[PDB]
Write a structure and sequence with these properties.
It is built from 15 helices and nine strands. The chain is an alpha+beta fold. It folds into four domains: 80 residues, DNA polymerase, domain 1 (Orthogonal Bundle); 57 residues, Orthogonal Bundle (DNA polymerase, domain 1), CATH 1.10.150.20; 123 residues, Beta Polymerase, domain 2; 63 residues, DNA polymerase, thumb domain (Beta Polymerase, domain 3, 2-Layer Sandwich), CATH 3.30.210. The chain has a five-stranded mixed beta sheet, with helices on both faces. The protein binds ligand GFC, chloride ion (3 copies), magnesium ion (MG) and sodium ion (3 copies). This is DNA polymerase beta.
Amino acid sequence: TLNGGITDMLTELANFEKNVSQAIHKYNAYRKAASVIAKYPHKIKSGAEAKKLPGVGTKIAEKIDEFLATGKLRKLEKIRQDDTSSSINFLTRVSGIGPSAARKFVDEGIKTLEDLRKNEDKLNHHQRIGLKYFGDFEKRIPREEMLQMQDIVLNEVKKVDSEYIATVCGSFRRGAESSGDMDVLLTHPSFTSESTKQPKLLHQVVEQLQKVHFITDTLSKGETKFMGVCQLPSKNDEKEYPHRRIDIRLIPKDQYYCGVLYFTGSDIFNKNMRAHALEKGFTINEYTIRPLGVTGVAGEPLPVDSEKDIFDYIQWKYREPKDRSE
DNA sequence: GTCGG
DNA sequence: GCTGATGCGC
DNA sequence: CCGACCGCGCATCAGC
Ligand SMILES: Nc1nc2c(ncn2[C@H]2C[C@H](O)[C@@H](COP(=O)(O)OP(=O)(O)[C@@](F)(Cl)P(=O)(O)O)O2)c(=O)[nH]1
Ligand SMILES: [Cl-]
Ligand SMILES: [Cl-]
Ligand SMILES: [Cl-]
Ligand SMILES: [Mg+2]
Ligand code: NA
Ligand code: NA
Ligand code: NA
């Protein structure tokens, strides 16, 4: 929070480019700058000082000076005043409503939470659940609650098949004292890159979690990825906990390290690392790390036995999970 | 919007 | 039904 | 300049 003002501004600018302008590269340009500045161990004094960091160019440097001088940005002041931009930004806050759907709804006169509710008919399944738990999904999850949730998930999974291995990733694995949701990596020995020896591997876990009323809703569900809603159980007479977003990713057992690297993040860390990988002539996804031939085509998966092995291939000193929060 | 070649 | 492009989210 | 910007699972659609 050393340069909170500045990083907030860049984040607001990032969200505007993404939601309203549908300018994804500008979105990331601002996010990166916000990321690099949030990490800077000095209270920024000028745009020039900021322009020294990678990701901060002339435009952002200029904005930082305006912000430091006045304590605000005129460009953002006007963006806030604009009713169309405001409505669009708001609607994208509902899970399932992106920049396109948001702009479309606004074109129909649907601009508020009140409008969305009275128009459920115009929403697909995901958007309907996003609206249902709109308030809840805005809440942070204390680590203490993440710990209780982890205990339920691992124990329920164990009951389905002792050979299952569920690992909580995301910011939780990064040591955060609060998380925006729960990310669960799942593996089973019967599912590898070589073959699937048993079907419904993900389904059974989902099924079991619904049986005990932990999983309450489903946003989307496939053979290897579940996106849904869960809730901790509350005691007698006590207010029940808010509903939480939960994602479960089933990855081939022999590709765990690439999988846990991916799911631990952060997203920007993944983007930076995968970009660096490319520079070093490699390509990384949640399954493997492969070399890039002269042509530019991915070769065969390289051997991996730890997260560190991935970092070594691209000549990066190993970074613990707690230091990947970019 | 920023960067490297 | 399929394939592929697009939206959306991780 | 100017091209590059990470990589992919699921839901949905158009075109066949
Ligand atoms: N490669 C890649 N990985 C991504 C991307 N987005 C997410 N991931 C990976 C890396 C992410 O760590 C992981 C989980 O996605 P979240 O839950 O959205 O991210 P988080 O858990 O870190 C969080 F801090 Cl935003 P919290 O949920 O606590 O508020 O998915 C992306 O664009 N690209
Ligand atoms: Cl763009
Ligand atoms: Cl691996
Ligand atoms: Cl792969
Ligand atoms: Mg998360
Ligand atoms: Na710079
Ligand atoms: Na959204
Ligand atoms: Na998540």
